[PDB]
Write a protein that holds these residues in place. Structure first.
Motif, PDB file in Angstrom:
ATOM      1  N   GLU A  96       0.806  -1.220   0.000  1.00  0.00           N
ATOM      2  CA  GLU A  96       0.000   0.000   0.000  1.00  0.00           C
ATOM      3  C   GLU A  96       0.839   1.270   0.000  1.00  0.00           C
ATOM      4  OE1 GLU A  96      -1.060  -2.315   2.556  1.00  0.00           O
ATOM      5  OE2 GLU A  96      -2.987  -2.976   1.758  1.00  0.00           O
ATOM      6  N   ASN A  97       2.169   1.147  -0.003  1.00  0.00           N
ATOM      7  CA  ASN A  97       3.110   2.272  -0.006  1.00  0.00           C
ATOM      8  C   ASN A  97       2.876   3.201   1.188  1.00  0.00           C
ATOM      9  OD1 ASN A  97       4.916   4.450  -0.863  1.00  0.00           O
ATOM     10  ND2 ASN A  97       4.837   3.489  -2.890  1.00  0.00           N
ATOM     11  N   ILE A  98       2.961   2.616   2.381  1.00  0.00           N
ATOM     12  CA  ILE A  98       2.742   3.324   3.637  1.00  0.00           C
ATOM     13  C   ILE A  98       3.969   3.139   4.517  1.00  0.00           C
ATOM     14  CG2 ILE A  98       1.396   3.310   5.777  1.00  0.00           C
ATOM     15  CD1 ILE A  98      -1.031   2.669   4.035  1.00  0.00           C
ATOM     16  N   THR A  99       4.486   4.247   5.052  1.00  0.00           N
ATOM     17  CA  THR A  99       5.764   4.250   5.752  1.00  0.00           C
ATOM     18  C   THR A  99       5.654   4.246   7.271  1.00  0.00           C
ATOM     19  OG1 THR A  99       5.771   6.644   5.379  1.00  0.00           O
ATOM     20  CG2 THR A  99       7.101   5.289   3.900  1.00  0.00           C
ATOM     21  N   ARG A 100       4.448   4.234   7.833  1.00  0.00           N
ATOM     22  CA  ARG A 100       4.256   4.341   9.275  1.00  0.00           C
ATOM     23  C   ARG A 100       3.332   3.235   9.759  1.00  0.00           C
ATOM     24  NH1 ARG A 100       6.443   9.205  11.933  1.00  0.00           N
ATOM     25  NH2 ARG A 100       6.147   7.786  13.710  1.00  0.00           N
ATOM     26  N   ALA A 101       3.699   2.597  10.868  1.00  0.00           N
ATOM     27  CA  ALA A 101       2.853   1.569  11.454  1.00  0.00           C
ATOM     28  C   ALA A 101       3.132   1.439  12.942  1.00  0.00           C
ATOM     29  CB  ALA A 101       3.053   0.209  10.783  1.00  0.00           C
ATOM     30  N   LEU A 102       2.125   0.961  13.668  1.00  0.00           N
ATOM     31  CA  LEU A 102       2.259   0.552  15.057  1.00  0.00           C
ATOM     32  C   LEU A 102       2.054  -0.951  15.133  1.00  0.00           C
ATOM     33  CD1 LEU A 102      -0.090   3.139  16.820  1.00  0.00           C
ATOM     34  CD2 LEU A 102       2.311   3.459  16.292  1.00  0.00           C
ATOM     35  N   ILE A 103       2.822  -1.615  15.984  1.00  0.00           N
ATOM     36  CA  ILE A 103       2.691  -3.050  16.192  1.00  0.00           C
ATOM     37  C   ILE A 103       2.302  -3.264  17.646  1.00  0.00           C
ATOM     38  CG2 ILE A 103       3.769  -5.286  15.959  1.00  0.00           C
ATOM     39  CD1 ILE A 103       5.942  -3.469  14.274  1.00  0.00           C
ATOM     40  N   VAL A 104       1.043  -3.616  17.881  1.00  0.00           N
ATOM     41  CA  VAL A 104       0.531  -3.862  19.222  1.00  0.00           C
ATOM     42  C   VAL A 104       0.737  -5.337  19.529  1.00  0.00           C
ATOM     43  CG1 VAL A 104      -1.418  -3.622  20.776  1.00  0.00           C
ATOM     44  CG2 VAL A 104      -1.153  -2.044  18.858  1.00  0.00           C
ATOM     45  N   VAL A 105       1.840  -5.655  20.192  1.00  0.00           N
ATOM     46  CA  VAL A 105       2.192  -7.028  20.534  1.00  0.00           C
ATOM     47  C   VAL A 105       1.517  -7.409  21.842  1.00  0.00           C
ATOM     48  CG1 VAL A 105       4.369  -6.751  19.341  1.00  0.00           C
ATOM     49  CG2 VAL A 105       4.265  -6.412  21.787  1.00  0.00           C
ATOM     50  N   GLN A 106       1.487  -8.712  22.124  1.00  0.00           N
ATOM     51  CA  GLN A 106       0.938  -9.185  23.388  1.00  0.00           C
ATOM     52  C   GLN A 106       2.035  -9.369  24.428  1.00  0.00           C
ATOM     53  OE1 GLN A 106      -1.208 -12.789  21.355  1.00  0.00           O
ATOM     54  NE2 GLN A 106      -2.764 -11.722  22.570  1.00  0.00           N
ATOM     55  N   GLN A 107       2.996 -10.245  24.146  1.00  0.00           N
ATOM     56  CA  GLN A 107       4.056 -10.502  25.108  1.00  0.00           C
ATOM     57  C   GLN A 107       5.278  -9.638  24.820  1.00  0.00           C
ATOM     58  OE1 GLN A 107       7.221 -12.303  24.693  1.00  0.00           O
ATOM     59  NE2 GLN A 107       7.665 -11.992  26.871  1.00  0.00           N
ATOM     60  N   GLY A 108       5.631  -9.473  23.551  1.00  0.00           N
ATOM     61  CA  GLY A 108       6.742  -8.606  23.212  1.00  0.00           C
ATOM     62  C   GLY A 108       7.417  -9.054  21.934  1.00  0.00           C
ATOM     63  N   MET A 109       8.563  -8.443  21.665  1.00  0.00           N
ATOM     64  CA  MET A 109       9.411  -8.821  20.548  1.00  0.00           C
ATOM     65  C   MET A 109      10.750  -9.328  21.053  1.00  0.00           C
ATOM     66  SD  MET A 109       8.828  -6.205  17.323  1.00  0.00           S
ATOM     67  CE  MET A 109       7.232  -5.417  17.413  1.00  0.00           C
ATOM     68  N   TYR A 124      10.829   2.733   6.609  1.00  0.00           N
ATOM     69  CA  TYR A 124       9.516   2.573   7.223  1.00  0.00           C
ATOM     70  C   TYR A 124       9.638   2.676   8.736  1.00  0.00           C
ATOM     71  CZ  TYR A 124       9.281   0.321   2.679  1.00  0.00           C
ATOM     72  OH  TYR A 124       9.416   0.025   1.343  1.00  0.00           O
ATOM     73  N   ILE A 125       8.813   3.528   9.337  1.00  0.00           N
ATOM     74  CA  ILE A 125       8.840   3.752  10.778  1.00  0.00           C
ATOM     75  C   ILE A 125       7.869   2.774  11.425  1.00  0.00           C
ATOM     76  CG2 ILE A 125       8.395   5.360  12.636  1.00  0.00           C
ATOM     77  CD1 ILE A 125       9.104   6.847   9.264  1.00  0.00           C
ATOM     78  N   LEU A 126       8.384   1.919  12.304  1.00  0.00           N
ATOM     79  CA  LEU A 126       7.599   0.865  12.933  1.00  0.00           C
ATOM     80  C   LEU A 126       7.753   0.976  14.442  1.00  0.00           C
ATOM     81  CD1 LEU A 126       7.600  -0.357   9.998  1.00  0.00           C
ATOM     82  CD2 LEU A 126       7.608  -2.576  11.086  1.00  0.00           C
ATOM     83  N   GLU A 127       6.633   1.166  15.122  1.00  0.00           N
ATOM     84  CA  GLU A 127       6.685   1.393  16.576  1.00  0.00           C
ATOM     85  C   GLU A 127       6.067   0.222  17.318  1.00  0.00           C
ATOM     86  OE1 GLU A 127       5.195   4.500  14.659  1.00  0.00           O
ATOM     87  OE2 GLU A 127       5.843   6.098  16.008  1.00  0.00           O
ATOM     88  N   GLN A 128       6.873  -0.511  18.068  1.00  0.00           N
ATOM     89  CA  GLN A 128       6.322  -1.587  18.905  1.00  0.00           C
ATOM     90  C   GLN A 128       5.535  -0.955  20.040  1.00  0.00           C
ATOM     91  OE1 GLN A 128       9.268  -4.092  20.653  1.00  0.00           O
ATOM     92  NE2 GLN A 128       7.754  -5.376  21.689  1.00  0.00           N
ATOM     93  N   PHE A 129       4.390  -1.512  20.414  1.00  0.00           N
ATOM     94  CA  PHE A 129       3.649  -1.020  21.593  1.00  0.00           C
ATOM     95  C   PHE A 129       3.010  -2.212  22.282  1.00  0.00           C
ATOM     96  CE2 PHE A 129       3.177   3.470  20.328  1.00  0.00           C
ATOM     97  CZ  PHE A 129       2.916   4.068  21.534  1.00  0.00           C
ATOM     98  N   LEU A 130       3.444  -2.567  23.486  1.00  0.00           N
ATOM     99  CA  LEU A 130       2.894  -3.733  24.219  1.00  0.00           C
ATOM    100  C   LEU A 130       1.406  -3.523  24.477  1.00  0.00           C
ATOM    101  CD1 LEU A 130       4.296  -6.264  25.394  1.00  0.00           C
ATOM    102  CD2 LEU A 130       5.909  -4.479  24.711  1.00  0.00           C
ATOM    103  N   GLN A 131       0.631  -4.593  24.636  1.00  0.00           N
ATOM    104  CA  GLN A 131      -0.793  -4.487  24.933  1.00  0.00           C
ATOM    105  C   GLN A 131      -1.018  -3.999  26.359  1.00  0.00           C
ATOM    106  OE1 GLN A 131      -2.515  -8.317  25.401  1.00  0.00           O
ATOM    107  NE2 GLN A 131      -4.646  -7.621  25.291  1.00  0.00           N
ATOM    108  N   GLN A 132      -0.175  -4.453  27.293  1.00  0.00           N
ATOM    109  CA  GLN A 132      -0.254  -3.996  28.674  1.00  0.00           C
ATOM    110  C   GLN A 132      -0.053  -2.490  28.770  1.00  0.00           C
ATOM    111  OE1 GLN A 132      -1.076  -6.252  31.394  1.00  0.00           O
ATOM    112  NE2 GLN A 132      -1.569  -4.150  31.993  1.00  0.00           N
ATOM    113  N   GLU A 133       0.866  -1.939  27.974  1.00  0.00           N
ATOM    114  CA  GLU A 133       1.091  -0.500  27.995  1.00  0.00           C
ATOM    115  C   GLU A 133      -0.079   0.256  27.382  1.00  0.00           C
ATOM    116  OE1 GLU A 133       4.691  -0.171  25.856  1.00  0.00           O
ATOM    117  OE2 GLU A 133       5.927  -1.064  27.436  1.00  0.00           O
TER     118      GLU A 133
END
Ligand SMILES: [Zn+2]
Ligand SMILES: [Zn+2]
Lengths: 209, 240, 179, 302, 116, 399, 48
Positions: A96-109, A124-133
DNA sequence: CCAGCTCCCTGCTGGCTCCGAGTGGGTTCTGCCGCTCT
RNA sequence: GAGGGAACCCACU
DNA sequence: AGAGCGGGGAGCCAGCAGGGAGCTGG
């Protein structure tokens, strides 16, 4: 249990809507205040059965000023996230030619996953974000004051008013929870508005380091 | 100068007659102490006969100690209040307390009515022997006079057990002073060396030696702290 | 503060003694040596420690303690500065003869009565005549030196007003009285 | 509540300590759960850490090679209703600790079956509260059952959050921790609402919790608030903690001094302790650093 | 039901529990030597979390001879009818939740202990 | 005064008796034995050399030290090849000067009436109890210490050991530095909680059952008879079980002493020398007060089992933990014990120097004079220095 | 050391004397480094 | 295929620096005893 | 018209 | 023979030994 995890999924989605609205992305008022009834009706009740499925929860939003500036919000099914998962999601971001995303993980990476995120960050800017947070909105806490990300013209106007350099400002880490909430990189300046016992209102400025 | 030279006319003393209470007040204090000691014995009988119900968040020791201490503190407060109500307008302890020059009502209570419970580390006098505070008591004696409640005043004089327990109590204050001096001095030195170079600059900002902005205005309002005063906002509390 | 201390007026630090005469008395007063007992006898018996050395066990600890106190109070085999403690709940008897123990004299009370009678005071009104002294008061079994670890098993009256009592007497088993 | 105050708490504040002596949370509740006592007790029980050791009266181990003929002979009927390793783990739970935690035994049983992945099977019945544990399929199985029994007793969480050792429920009688609202008349009304105090810090889990206020629930731990909420939030929390320490005696210090100290410790984006490790690691010159502490080390470093 | 340490009769060491699958029964085997023995109890271990309530089995009668203990006349001995009894609290680490008074008859040759 | 009188009447005599005799070989054999001490009254020797009775005011004014000479009887026996023993008796040999406490038994103010003291320009109300060192009145402050030879069980906070028994074991009737044994128990933070033993001059923990086998008790029944006195108590069995589990692998005595000697200060390369090192540690150096001679293993094992029993009583909550600040757990070293510790050290140094001198004069020579052998400056200047400065030990280790 | 390397000398005495030189220089700079004996005055007190 | 396999995560643990300000007064000590050579 | 240090102890606020 | 001279706790930061994904390699 399906009910409590559906509650978590609804709360994560609401927090992401508030976060994307805070970043300037176009999120409509109906999905800001989406109740648990509306989430259950729109998505489902039994995630283990699979009526609300996390890959079906993926959000796509666009910026208010720039319609082509879009951000994805991904919800991986698997608890950990490994290299193949970011590879799949980044191929999707390419197509889709998109450079920004958030990754809402459960336990982590795993560390290799975060390293790959840092490696692909220039393109591409990729931001990990835990579900607990993300289970709460920390900017609604009484301790967190009002953060406003400043534009470059505002930063230059600030540093000419106070005849300041960038390193003479107070600092905020790029890994700060509010800095992660607003998705800000180094060199950006955050205008903090807070109340004051002596003055009433006080505005601080913090450079991202 | 003016008040010190009027004091040559008026004069001001303290004597043993300012620590004397009335006979009726002595009977009132004795009655209060007797009733409170009997109440402590009743609580001891309740705990001994297993009729003491523990309170939320506390063990049976903690409930028993809290209830006994509440009884004893109520006794000390009531005997003290009786002592201050006994005082005449000519009393000199009262004269220095109501002027704020020296002493408190607690000092008047201890001198006239009851010294009170002696505490070591926030609790009663500990069982330094095998379940006894002193070898002059029976084992497992949780009553007031065994565990450090001084039912005498400073004018009445303390009994030898009360004297020893009061020495235990005062040694605590001496130790606290002697060991708080060094830690407080270290805290002051660290605070100074952390903020010695922070100062208000000529653009009214507050910056350290690296010229980095700590505050944009001093105290967020730019005012010095030696001229601000307590005031009331007249529009905050009233209704619409 | 609290680290440098001062002796009380009648406090006396014990100078030290040899355990040997007490050991010879204990061997000939029904104590059984650890070498010649089966361990099964230990459970219901009282262990005997002399200067921290377990020297044997005894089956009648009260009679042994009474005999030991009677020997000390007449300045027999056990000298006056020897400490004798009966951990009754723990079934132990500890005898200490070493130096460094700090003790003080106490008036012995037997059956709610002082052993100090008017004859002792009338004799002590004339030290310079009768040659009666404090050592004669110790040898009469009237006062005895109690150290801290022995004091934790004694029952003290602050005054002889405590020995004479009524109502809830608080205690009728006073063993010693403050001078 | 054994909260620390005075000089030691000020020491724990200016020296940014990862281990406060008495870490705590001030949990505020939302809506009806704040008002009535029993729903607040539900919140307390869902925050209070509960292991198996809290609710257990007895754990016994048996050699029962034939469950059709139980050696205990008190469990025979329902074991024969249900009816493998010959090693039995019979767990008897205490009645009152079973009741006040608001647990039912199937919740416990499904916690074991979730935790061990059904490598070991669990039978249970109550009406004496009894569970039975066997291991389905040289480090003998009784010693393995020893090990899993200790793991069940110590490191198994039934309900609650691990870092919260204890929770105190109380209704504050003073306005310092009351719910201050603005009525329709326009006055300030103090509402007495049930609040919880903790003996550990797991603030992120507690903030995510059902019916817990996500706005006003706070901690007394500086490092934990910094990690959860940010740097301006920990600036305000550090202000609040210092003000509490100073004004416990009723003494007053002007706000600007507290604000300057908190601004000094939070100016560079992280928590700068008032130590050599915080002050000596700034961009100050070597001479200030050597004047403070570790003089020779700083001068060799420069 | 508690289980104690059982001893091999030859070499006096500690018998470890074991099973034999052919008989499928619990046998206690020494492992200094090769001795085995049939187990009288199928109990190998019990853990007693909340069974520290019993303290009367720890009291000995010799505390009736303690001069520093409190004595009472209002609690006669049930075993012999002696009026006087010493009373005390529990001297254990489990006393932190109990002010329980234990009474011991002061008459010699009786030594009866009870509670209330 | 009483402590100093015990020190002079008894303690220096037992220090001289406790001194092992001097065996010296080239080879001719020389045995030196110190038998009987004598203490004179405080006397002064001027440059003329005439002895005079020295008054305390003379010592105060002239900055002298109020000390008395200490004489000892020495016997020298010479053993030659094909020749009988030679017995030489040096009577009253001067070895040093002991400072004298004022108004003690061996002070010149002893037994004097108030008129006699006033004729000596002494205050009769003066208590005595001090020394005059270089004209300065020095008082020995009594020193607190934990009581020796008594088992104390504490709880080490923030440690990997939950409970710890402790006994600073010191030999009675003799002056000897205390050796501390720690029979302790690990914290729960291990399938069971095990009982361990920290030994003197052993760098590593060794488990307690291995020690019990090392004194010569191989059966677990025999060991548990020394640890648990009533076998009808199951809980103490349940806590002694992990120690038996951890120490099962050693089952006989010699491998147990090998396991002990594996981690001494210097591990012996020879296994037999390791066994001898373990015997020397477990006999001479572990619990000296219950026994020091050979074949005293049962009393030592019983006391060690008592220490383990006290540890298990505390771990059950069956007995209250001891208090460090309880003052029956403390002893007070007065002038007697302190001066006796000093005098033991300095008599050891004097024996070392006499032995060195006589070895030097038998290595190349044939005989030595014993008057030249004894350096009285050792005892005299060591006592004078420690009483003058207060730094209580040796001069070169004053820090 | 200069005398020793000026003439013929063994390697081990050179290494030991280098160890003494290093110890003396380091104790001139810092006389509280752990694991090594303190440089002391002949009276017995450590140097400053 | 699945066993092989490197490289950043957690955790114990030894090193390491720190531990109020300012005053009086005292004493003892450094600086030490064998010599080898005339 | 001014020639020791160091260590330790005691004390003062 | 005799003189001068040779000779305690409390808290950090870093470094090591064990983990566990995982790309490269059949
Ligand atoms: Zn066997
Ligand atoms: Zn009876």
């Amino acid at each position: 249990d399906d009910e409590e995890e559906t509650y978590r999924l609804w709360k994560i989605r609401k927090t992401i809507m508030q976060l994307c609205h805070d970043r300037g992305y176009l999120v409509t008022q109906d999905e800001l205040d989406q109740t648990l009834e509306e989430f259950k009706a729109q998505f489902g009740d039994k995630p283990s059965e699979g009526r609300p499925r996390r890959t079906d929860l993926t959000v796509l939003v666009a910026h208010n000023d720039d319609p082509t500036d879009q951000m994805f919000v991904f919800f991986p099914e698997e608890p950990k996230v490994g290299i193949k998962t970011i590879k799949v999601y980044c191929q999707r971001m390419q197509e889709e030619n998109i450079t920004r995303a958030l990754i809402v993980v459960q336990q982590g990476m795993t560390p290799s996953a975060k390293q790959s995120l840092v490696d692909m960050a220039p393109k591409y800017i990729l931001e990990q974000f835990l579900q607990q947070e993300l289970l709460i909105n920390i900017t609604e806490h009484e301790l967190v004051p009002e953060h406003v990300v400043m534009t470059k013209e505002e930063v230059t106007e600030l540093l000419a008013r106070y005849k300041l350099r960038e390193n003479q400002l107070p600092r905020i880490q790029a890994g700060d929870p509010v800095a992660r909430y607003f998705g800000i990189k180094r060199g950006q300046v955050v205008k903090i508005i807070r109340p004051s016992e002596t003055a009433g209102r006080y505005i601080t400025y913090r450079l991202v380091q | 100068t003016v008040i010190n030279n009027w004091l040559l006319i008026e004069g001001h003393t303290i004597g043993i007659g300012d620590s004397i209470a009335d006979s009726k007040t002595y009977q009132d204090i004795q009655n209060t102490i007797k009733k409170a000691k009997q109440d402590v014995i009743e609580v001891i009988e309740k705990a001994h006969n297993n009729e003491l119900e523990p309170t939320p968040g506390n063990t049976l020791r903690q409930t028993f100690e809290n209830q006994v201490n509440r009884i004893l503190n109520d006794a000390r407060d009531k005997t003290g209040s009786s002592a201050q109500k006994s005082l005449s307008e000519y009393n000199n302890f009262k004269s220095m307390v109501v002027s704020g020059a020296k002493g408190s009502k607690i000092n008047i209570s201890q001198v006239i009515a009851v010294v009170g419970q002696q505490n070591v580390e926030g609790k009663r006098i500990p069982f330094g022997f095998k379940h006894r505070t002193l070898p002059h008591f029976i084992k497992d004696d949780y009553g007031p006079e065994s565990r450090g409640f001084v039912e005498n005043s400073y004018l009445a004089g303390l009994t030898p057990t009360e004297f020893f327990f009061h020495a235990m109590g005062g040694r605590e204050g001496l130790i606290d002073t002697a060991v708080k001096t060094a830690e407080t001095g270290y805290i002051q030195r660290r605070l100074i060396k952390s903020m010695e170079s922070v100062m208000v600059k000529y653009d009214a900002t507050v910056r350290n030696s690296i010229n980095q902005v700590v505050q944009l205005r001093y105290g967020e309002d730019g005012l010095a702290g030696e001229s601000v005063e307590f005031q009331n906002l007249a529009t905050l509390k009233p209704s619409n | 503060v609290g680290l440098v201390k001062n002796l009380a007026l009648m406090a006396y630090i014990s100078v030290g003694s040899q355990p040997s005469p007490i050991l010879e008395f204990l061997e000939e007063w029904s104590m059984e040596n650890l070498e010649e007992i089966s361990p099964a006898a230990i459970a219901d018996a009282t262990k005997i420690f002399v200067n921290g050395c377990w020297v044997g066990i005894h089956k009648d600890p009260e009679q042994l303690m009474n005999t030991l106190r009677k020997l000390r109070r007449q300045m027999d085999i056990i000298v006056s500065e020897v400490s004798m403690i009966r951990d009754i709940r723990e079934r132990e008897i500890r005898i200490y003869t070493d130096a460094g123990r700090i003790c003080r004299p106490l008036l012995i009370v037997e059956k709610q009565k002082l052993l100090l009678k008017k004859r002792h005071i009338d004799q002590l009104k004339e030290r310079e005549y009768n040659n009666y002294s404090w050592q004669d008061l110790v040898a009469s079994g009237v006062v005895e030196y109690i150290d801290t670890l022995e004091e934790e098993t004694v029952m003290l009256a602050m005054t002889p007003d405590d020995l004479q009592e009524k109502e809830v007497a608080y205690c009728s088993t006073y063993t010693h009285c403050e001078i | 509540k054994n909260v620390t105050l005075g000089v030691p708490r000020l020491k724990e504040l200016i020296n940014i300590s990862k281990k406060p002596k008495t870490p705590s949370l001030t949990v505020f509740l939302l809506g009806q759960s704040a008002r009535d006592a029993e729903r607040a007790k539900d919140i307390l029980c869902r925050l209070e850490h509960t292991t198996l050791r809290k609710v257990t009266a007895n754990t016994a181990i048996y050699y029962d090679p034939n469950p059709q003929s139980t050696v205990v002979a008190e469990d025979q009927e329902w074991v024969n209703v249900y009816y493998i390793s010959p090693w039995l783990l019979r767990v008897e739970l205490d009645r009152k600790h079973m009741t006040d935690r608001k647990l039912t035994m199937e919740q416990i049983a499904e916690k074991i079956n979730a935790g061990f992945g059904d490598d070991l099977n669990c039978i249970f019945n109550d009406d004496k509260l009894v569970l039975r544990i066997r291991i389905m399929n040289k480090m003998d199985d009784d010693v393995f059952l020893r090990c899993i029994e200790s793991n069940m007793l110590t490191d198994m969480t039934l309900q609650g959050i691990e870092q919260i050792s204890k929770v105190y429920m109380h209704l504050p009688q003073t306005d310092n921790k009351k719910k201050i609202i603005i009525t329709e008349d326009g006055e300030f009304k103090a509402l007495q609402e049930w609040i919880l105090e903790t003996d550990g810090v797991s603030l992120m889990r507690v903030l995510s919790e059902k019916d817990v206020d996500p706005v006003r629930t706070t901690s007394n731990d500086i490092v934990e608030i910094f990690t959860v909420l940010g740097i301006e939030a920990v600036r305000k929390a550090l202000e609040r903690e210092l003000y509490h320490v100073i004004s416990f005696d009723g003494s007053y210090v002007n706000y600007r001094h507290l604000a300057l100290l908190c601004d000094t410790m939070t100016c560079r984006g992280h928590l700068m302790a008032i130590t050599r490790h915080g002050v000596n690691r700034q961009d100050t010159g070597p001479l200030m650093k050597c004047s403070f502490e570790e003089t020779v080390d700083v001068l060799m470093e420069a | 039901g508690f289980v104690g340490i059982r001893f091999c009769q030859e070499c006096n060491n500690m018998l470890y529990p074991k099973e034999d699958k052919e008989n499928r029964i619990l046998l206690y085997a020494c492992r200094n030597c090769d001795y085995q023995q049939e187990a009288d109890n199928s109990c190998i271990y019990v853990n007693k979390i909340t069974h520290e309530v019993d303290e009367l089995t720890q009291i000995i009668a010799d505390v009736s001879q303690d001069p520093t203990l409190p004595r009472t006349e209002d609690h006669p001995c049930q075993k012999c009818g002696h009026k006087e009894a010493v009373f005390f609290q529990s001297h254990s680490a489990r006393a932190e939740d109990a002010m329980r008074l234990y009474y011991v008859c002061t008459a010699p040759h009786c030594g009866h202990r009870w509670t209330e | 005064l009483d402590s100093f009188d015990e020190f002079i009447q008894m303690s220096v005599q037992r220090i001289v008796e406790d001194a092992p005799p001097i065996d010296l070989q080239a080879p001719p054999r020389y045995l030196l034995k110190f038998e009987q001490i004598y203490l004179s009254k405080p006397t002064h020797w001027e440059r003329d050399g005439a002895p005079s009775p020295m008054m305390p005011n003379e010592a105060r004014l002239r900055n002298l030290t109020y000390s008395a000479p200490l004489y000892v009887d020495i016997t020298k026996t010479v053993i030659k090849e094909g020749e009988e023993q030679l017995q030489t008796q040096h009577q009253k040999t001067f070895i040093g000067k002991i400072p004298i406490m004022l108004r003690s038994t061996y002070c010149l103010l002893n037994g004097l009436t108030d008129r006699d003291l006033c004729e000596l320009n002494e205050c009769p109300l003066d208590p005595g109890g001090y020394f005059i060192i270089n004209g300065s009145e020095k008082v020995l402050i009594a020193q607190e210490k934990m009581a020796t030879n008594t088992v104390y069980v504490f709880a080490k906070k923030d440690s990997k050991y939950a409970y710890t028994g402790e006994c600073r074991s010191c030999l009675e009737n003799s002056s000897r530095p205390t050796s501390t044994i720690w029979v302790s128990m690990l914290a729960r933070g291990a399938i069971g909680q095990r009982i361990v033993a920290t030994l003197p001059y052993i760098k590593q923990e060794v488990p307690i059952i291995i020690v019990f086998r090392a004194l010569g008790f191989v059966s677990d029944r025999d060991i548990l008879e020394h640890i648990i006195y009533d076998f009808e108590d199951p809980e103490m069995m349940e806590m002694v079980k992990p120690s038996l589990d951890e120490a099962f692998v050693i089952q006989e005595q010699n491998v147990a002493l090998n396991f002990i000697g594996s981690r001494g200060a210097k591990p012996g390369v020879t296994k037999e020398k390791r066994i001898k090192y373990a015997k020397e540690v477990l006999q001479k150096e572990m619990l000296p007060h219950v026994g020091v001679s050979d074949f005293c293993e049962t009393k030592k094992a019983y006391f060690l089992g008592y220490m383990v029993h006290r540890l298990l009583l505390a771990a059950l909550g069956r007995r209250e933990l001891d208090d460090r600040d309880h003052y029956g757990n403390k002893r007070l070293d007065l002038a007697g014990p302190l001066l006796a510790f000093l005098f033991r050290g300095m008599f050891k140094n004097l024996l070392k120097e006499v032995r060195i001198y006589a070895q030097k004069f038998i290595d190349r020579g044939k005989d030595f004079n014993l008057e030249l052998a004894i350096k009285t400056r050792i005892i005299s200047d060591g006592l004078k220095y420690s009483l003058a400065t207060g730094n209580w030990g040796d001069q070169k280790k004053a820090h | 050391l200069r005398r020793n390397e000026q003439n013929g000398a063994a390697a081990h005495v050179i290494a030991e004397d280098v160890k003494l030189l290093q110890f003396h220089v380091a104790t001139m700079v810092d006389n509280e480094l752990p694991g090594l004996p303190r440089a002391m005055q002949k009276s017995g007190r450590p140097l400053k």
